[PDB]
Structures are given as C-alpha cells and as structure tokens.
Amino acid sequence: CPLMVKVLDAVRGSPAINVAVHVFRKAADDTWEPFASGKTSESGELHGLTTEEEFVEGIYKVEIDTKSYWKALGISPFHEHAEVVFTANDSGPRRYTIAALLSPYSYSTTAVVTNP
Template sequence: MDKASILVLLSSALVFCQGAPVDHGGSDSHCPLTVKILDAVKGIPAGNVALKVSRKGTNGTWEKISSGTTDIAGEVHEIITEQDFTPGVYRVEFDTKNYWKAEGRAPFHEVADVVFEAHAEGHRHYTLALLLSPFSYTTTAVVVKAHD
C-alpha cells in the first residue's frame, strides 16, 4: 500500500472518530471506554462485530472482563464500568474474521487486537476507532480527561 493510501486511511479513522455522536441513551462523557468501527470497503459503520475486553493480570495472563457487539452505527458504549476500568494494560479483541465471512469475503486476519495501558497519566476516557478491511486494519484512540 502506498503512502498516500495509508494517509487517507488514517485521516478517515480520525474523521470517523470525531464524527457526530449517535444517541445511545447516554453521554460518552460517562463511558470510560467506547469502541467505533468503520468498514473501509463499504465506507459505512461496521455493525455486528463481536469483541471482548481483557485486562492483563499481575501474572501476565489475560482476564476477560467484558464483551459486546457493535450496533448498527458500528459502536459499543458502556462496555465497561468506571469501577471495573482500573489502571492497567487492556486488550480489545475484535472478531474480524466472522464479520468478513458474513460479508462474503475471505479475510486475512482472525482478529484485530488493540493493546493499551489505561490511566497511566491519571483517570481518562478512551474512544478506540478501528478502520477495517479484509487484509488490514488501522486503529486510533482519542484519550480525554474524565469529567468530574
């Protein structure tokens, strides 16, 4: 993939992440972790993508703490509570294979993983954006100070 295509994909992910909020019965200011997925092939939100959230334990193993599925807007809100979203290393695993199979495509990746350290600089709220295609994925994050 050439540099121009990569820049377009990254720009699209940023724009997607900053898009107009969808009414999901609450405010993202109260969601410590929000996930948004865009299907780069069709240029629309990727609905019905299963995902799970795990936290790395002190012994190095991953403990599943939550799971969900993206809605029609390609989003998952309130996947974890403030109380459960403690400082540590987290992994969000997206089931990209089953999404693409349902779209009639044979994908390269089984899953897309995003691993990150939460709250290293104090309490924050995180929005993870995933730009998805059958042979690649790009992620970006918007990290903001939590509202009091």
C-alpha cells in the same frame, strides 16, 4: 463509559455493524483475564463495556473479531482479529475511544483519549 469502541467498514463506506468485541485485562500473574465484551450497534459503536469504578489502571487488550465480520459478508479476510493493546489510566482516569477501520487484508486503529 470510559471505554468506547467504534468500527468502520472501508469497503462499504459504512459503520461495521454487529462486530463482536472482547476486552481483556492483564492479571497479577501476567495472563489475559476476560474483562468485558459486546457487539457493535447499527452505528458501528459499542458503548457500556465498563464503568469508571471497574476500569482501573492496567494493561488492556481490545480484540475486534474482524474475521467473523468479513466471513458473514462472503469475504475470506487475512486477519483473525484486530488487537489493540494499551496501558490505561496510569495517569488518572481517562476516556478512551478505540476506533478501527476495516478492509479484508488491512486494518487501522487509532485511539482518542480525553480527560474527564
């Protein structure tokens, strides 16, 4: 898979399990079209969102549903979600890992981009 999402919990020091993730792609008419979705595993990872064929050039938005995650743990967090918006594959196909580290009032995100 050319797109993987990895989520960690900075309060517990653990993978963030069962986090819902929705991916969108900006359309020809400039709206956000649903592209893929899934939930993180026991390792905090979400594989198999898309294929090399389907993951064409475009502007993508990865929405990580952090509020639902925290609420299930009894925490009222600040953010509705974490959003990662980026152009993909504009210089040829790449492999993208979107990592996120979650706290109730803060998140970070970093991309690891590799070339096959």
